[PDB]
Amino acid sequence: MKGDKKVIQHLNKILGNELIAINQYFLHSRMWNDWGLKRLGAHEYHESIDEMKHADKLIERILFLEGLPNLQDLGKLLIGENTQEMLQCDLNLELKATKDLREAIVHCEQVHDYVSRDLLKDILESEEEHIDYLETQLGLIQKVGLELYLQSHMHE
Amino acid sequence: GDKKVIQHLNKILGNELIAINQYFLHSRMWNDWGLKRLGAHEYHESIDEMKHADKLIERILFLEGLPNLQDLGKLLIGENTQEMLQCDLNLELKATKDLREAIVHCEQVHDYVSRDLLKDILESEEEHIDYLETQLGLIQKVGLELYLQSHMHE
Amino acid sequence: GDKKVIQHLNKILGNELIAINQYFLHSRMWNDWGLKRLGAHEYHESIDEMKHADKLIERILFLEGLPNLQDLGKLLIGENTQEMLQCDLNLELKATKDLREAIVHCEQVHDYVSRDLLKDILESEEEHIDYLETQLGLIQKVGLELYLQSHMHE
Amino acid sequence: KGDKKVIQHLNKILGNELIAINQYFLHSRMWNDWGLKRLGAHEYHESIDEMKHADKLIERILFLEGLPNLQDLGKLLIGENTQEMLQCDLNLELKATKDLREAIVHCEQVHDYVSRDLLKDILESEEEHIDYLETQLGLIQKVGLELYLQSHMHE
Amino acid sequence: KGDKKVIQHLNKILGNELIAINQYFLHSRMWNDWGLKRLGAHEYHESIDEMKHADKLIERILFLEGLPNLQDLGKLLIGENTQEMLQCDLNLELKATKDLREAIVHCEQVHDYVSRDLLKDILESEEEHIDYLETQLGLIQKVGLELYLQSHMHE
Amino acid sequence: KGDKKVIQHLNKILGNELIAINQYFLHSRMWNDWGLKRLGAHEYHESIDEMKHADKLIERILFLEGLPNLQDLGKLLIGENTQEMLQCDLNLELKATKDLREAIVHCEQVHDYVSRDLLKDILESEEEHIDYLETQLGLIQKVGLELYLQSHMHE
Amino acid sequence: GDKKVIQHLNKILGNELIAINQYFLHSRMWNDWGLKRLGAHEYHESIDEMKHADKLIERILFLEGLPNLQDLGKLLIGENTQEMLQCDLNLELKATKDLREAIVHCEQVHDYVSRDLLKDILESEEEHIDYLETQLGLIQKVGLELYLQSHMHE
Ligand code: HEM
Ligand code: HEM
Ligand code: HEM
Ligand SMILES: [Fe+2]
Ligand SMILES: [Fe+2]
Ligand SMILES: [Fe+2]
Ligand SMILES: [Fe+2]
Ligand SMILES: [Fe+2]
Ligand SMILES: [Fe+2]
Ligand SMILES: [Fe+2]
Ligand SMILES: [Fe+2]
Ligand SMILES: [Fe+2]
Ligand SMILES: [Fe+2]
Ligand SMILES: [Fe+2]
Ligand SMILES: [Fe+2]
Ligand SMILES: [Fe+2]
Ligand SMILES: [Fe+2]
Ligand SMILES: [Fe+2]
Ligand SMILES: [Fe+2]
Ligand SMILES: [Fe+2]
Ligand SMILES: [Fe+2]
Ligand SMILES: [Fe+2]
Ligand SMILES: [Fe+2]
Ligand SMILES: [Fe+2]
Ligand SMILES: [Fe+2]
Ligand SMILES: [Fe+2]
Ligand SMILES: [Fe+2]
Ligand SMILES: [Fe+2]
Ligand SMILES: [Fe+2]
Ligand SMILES: [Fe+2]
Ligand SMILES: [Fe+2]
Ligand SMILES: [Fe+2]
Ligand SMILES: [Fe+2]
Ligand SMILES: [Fe+2]
Ligand SMILES: [Fe+2]
Ligand SMILES: [Fe+2]
Ligand SMILES: [Fe+2]
Ligand SMILES: [Fe+2]
Ligand SMILES: [Fe+2]
Ligand SMILES: [K+]
């Protein structure tokens, strides 16, 4: 059973996005920890872990479909230099990720690879949860102010 | 923090980032082939490199450096079990060479805490070399097929 | 219920009924030969198809159709381990082709609950394909006798 | 018998520990008196950490047949508000790590590797303390003094 | 805000505690170094007792709006052997109880009854230490030094 | 793979461990035979400690593709009474640590930092053993031989 | 204590001291090679000989002799698994010959407690011989590579 060439290419594209997010969120997590914003650092670590698990599932699916997972190409990390920029960078990355996920799902439907579609939909649900988290945090910065938002995320 | 020590630390970090991906892919390849014992052990090697990367990142930030997670070097991906193990060994031998050079520099500028971190990583890499050389020796002693059979089931 | 959806569900059900019997017989043949790990695994494949058949029967009755448990198609029975595994693989590949055609039809008439049921079965069949292709690949990598030895004891 | 200059170095490190014990203990109780109990508890634990380092150095000096010096207490850097107290602690820690590096150099030179390893363990702990202090000073810059204090009022 | 002379007295008692902490800690580690572990353990516990007294005095001084003095460390009385060490501790304790009685008199004079009660609790503890020390010196006389040391080798 | 002279050093340290295993095991069983059971038990644990060191050295030598030498057994220093046995153990330990320091120098020179760390760990344990031995000899001087023996008759 | 009995006991002790070191090194060789089941079993054989040595030392001291731990005879170190097992067997057969001669002498001078100790040691050596002859028999019956495969994993 060789999967569809274009589906495998789509899955490798989603994998590439996951690989960017893993590193981006891990660095942001450790930056927040370095700054003593430990609640932010812990949450961002868990975001990184979630992307690691997505990457794993994509790697497994690609190999089952007799494709070659691409872990060599690492795209541009969007690294902020303060809390507001870092969150916005994560949100920008997530919005790119979901655009790619939708185009991949379209392709899966068109060639009847419904299992790959379901996997991508599961990932998409998790990325929209991440967008929900990010948009809410940026909203909280507007509502309570940056300094109070940072204070709320100093201690776990 | 010393700028050349931070360069070294970022170099070691770069080596960890390659190993993470190389071992993770090799792990999932072995799993796809039904060599589940190899796949599980290789996954655990990958996790070990993730932990090393984490400590390096934390140290670089403490020393007010910028950790480099952007530049991913060349993955050494084998096409069968014998090549995969040799690729891992080739990577590890390069990693320990770089570790030794980084330790020298830490000693020279009296960064004894960075040296101790790198020595802990180096002991872990030498355990990995021990594992890899042992597996390649077993392939010579029992043959490839028996070695694979012995790593089919967990 | 849509008439052509019910026909598709009854076709998938027919595929499950073939699979139940083929896998159950293959299981008991392996147990008779003393290849108990294969017999146990094949027994669980048969049970999985039984559960799919149950879910299809229940769906057909909900949609006010008549489940067809009377028509049993051709069992693909092998005479040795390699043929049996390939017979199972050939049956699964036909099964996945019918499931995709049934899903296309469910989407067309907006029977999204039937589509979801068929998608869940499809994921289970692709896991069975993954298992079967892996086993055939292991036979190539370690040879038939070692593969059989590996599946003698549970 | 130990190397005489190694024992001198160990007694110098011990002297730094003795300053830090008292400085941190007083800062802790000042923060407790002011009702900044989270700062007070954390600083108490810094003081205890230095007490344990002092103990290990005393034991090592005695094993090497030296005389531990608990008599000469150097200058305590006592701040008058939270920002100064943290800065005082950081100033003390930086002097402490400099002395530790010079002691390790000397241990290495005379092949006293066990003393080196003891001082390296202490150095790891002092750098963790520097990490804590630099982080707190950075937090004061990022959220402001009053929020930083409020966050350290209750345990 | 407390009486200026009461605060001075409390700082004087605190100064005696800080000498005692360091003298007893060193003596404890000297006895451990010699393999007289029962003496070492007991002397360690005496040192901890003084640390806890010092803490209470610091807290009381800060409450009374005084400045605790952890900077001034008086003369440690370090012995060269078990008998001298025990006598050194006893000499220090007798000086300490003298200063405590004078501080209590002053607390009474100015109606600082809470500071008085704190100092009386500390004094009770010091007289228990004196009881311990005088009893050990008497055991050395009754069984001999070598038997006394043997009895305190193993915990 | 491993440095030829590093392997030589490791085999030298291993040789010293092999002497110590047998010397301490025999001293233990002599003390047991004499009814000095506390001495015999402690000396047994010293022997066990040396066995674990030898094991680690053997494993490291094999990893580095050297040939561990368990064939060459140097001179056991067997005493005739408790004081001589302790001094024989101390003489052996002091030769052991001298060799360990020379091996660490050589590991450092050729960047075998993992072998250095292993040898430093062994060195720390030998210095603990020296601490024990020097303390026992000091106790014999402080309380006398007969009381020292009495204290080590019963576990 | 009979002077000739003590000489015999010191001879047995000397055999134990060779065996401790030979089995301990063979154990760590097998571990280095990744034959962990062999390595663990050989470790336990080494420990068994340590315990025999201890009992002999205690008996000698009770009989007012001097235990000789200074003279270490020739270790028979093999270069591969079959050689190592044959080296162990050669040592054991020699050990049992000396044990039988020591027992003869104990019986002759009526040292029945020493005899009973040596008989206990001898029963253990004959069990070791049973193990070694069996392993060499297995190498003949299934072949070296399968024998090795069977002792890779604990
Ligand atoms: C910058 C690169 C990475 C870093 C720093 C990193 C770090 C970590 C850390 C610290 C853990 C927790 C390990 C533990 O303590 O148990 C972890 C877990 C894990 N990592 Fe990574 N990782 C990285 C990249 C990756 C990649 C590229 C993959 C896969 C393609 C991956 C897959 C996983 C998986 C599957 C887990 C277990 C998660 C779970 O089941 O909870 N990681 N990683
Ligand atoms: C101003 C001087 C000091 C004060 C106020 C002080 C206070 C304290 C306090 C409150 C404790 C906790 C005791 C307990 O609750 O059991 C303690 C423990 C301890 N102290 Fe001090 N101390 C001082 C100086 C020292 C010095 C100079 C040393 C050694 C050279 C030392 C060694 C120790 C040790 C080893 C502990 C036990 C820590 C543990 O294992 O948890 N202290 N001290
Ligand atoms: C190359 C020489 C030797 C090596 C590497 C060695 C190694 C070891 C090791 C690793 C252990 C287990 C220790 C633990 O983990 O607690 C042990 C136990 C022991 N050793 Fe040795 N050993 C050696 C020689 C000897 C000798 C020469 C004797 C006595 C004459 C001896 C007597 C014992 C005894 C009685 C035990 C405890 C066994 C038990 O009760 O299970 N060993 N040895
Ligand atoms: Fe994701
Ligand atoms: Fe597409
Ligand atoms: Fe799904
Ligand atoms: Fe995400
Ligand atoms: Fe939050
Ligand atoms: Fe690593
Ligand atoms: Fe360099
Ligand atoms: Fe460390
Ligand atoms: Fe590694
Ligand atoms: Fe099915
Ligand atoms: Fe249709
Ligand atoms: Fe569903
Ligand atoms: Fe199926
Ligand atoms: Fe299997
Ligand atoms: Fe098993
Ligand atoms: Fe310290
Ligand atoms: Fe110096
Ligand atoms: Fe250490
Ligand atoms: Fe500190
Ligand atoms: Fe905090
Ligand atoms: Fe007191
Ligand atoms: Fe007064
Ligand atoms: Fe009271
Ligand atoms: Fe007292
Ligand atoms: Fe007593
Ligand atoms: Fe003792
Ligand atoms: Fe040793
Ligand atoms: Fe050398
Ligand atoms: Fe280590
Ligand atoms: Fe030792
Ligand atoms: Fe034996
Ligand atoms: Fe005879
Ligand atoms: Fe018996
Ligand atoms: Fe044996
Ligand atoms: Fe076996
Ligand atoms: Fe294995
Ligand atoms: K607030």
PDB file of C-alpha atoms and ligand atoms in Angstrom, chain E residues 154, chain F residues 38 136 152, ligand 29:
ATOM      1  CA  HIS E 154      30.270   5.514  69.384  1.00  0.00           C
TER       2      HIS E 154
ATOM      3  CA  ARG F  38      33.164  -4.598  65.047  1.00  0.00           C
ATOM      4  CA  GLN F 136      41.290   4.846  64.472  1.00  0.00           C
ATOM      5  CA  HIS F 152      35.334  -2.996  68.833  1.00  0.00           C
TER       6      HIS F 152
HETATM    7 FE    FE H  29      34.322   2.381  65.813  1.00  0.00          FE
END
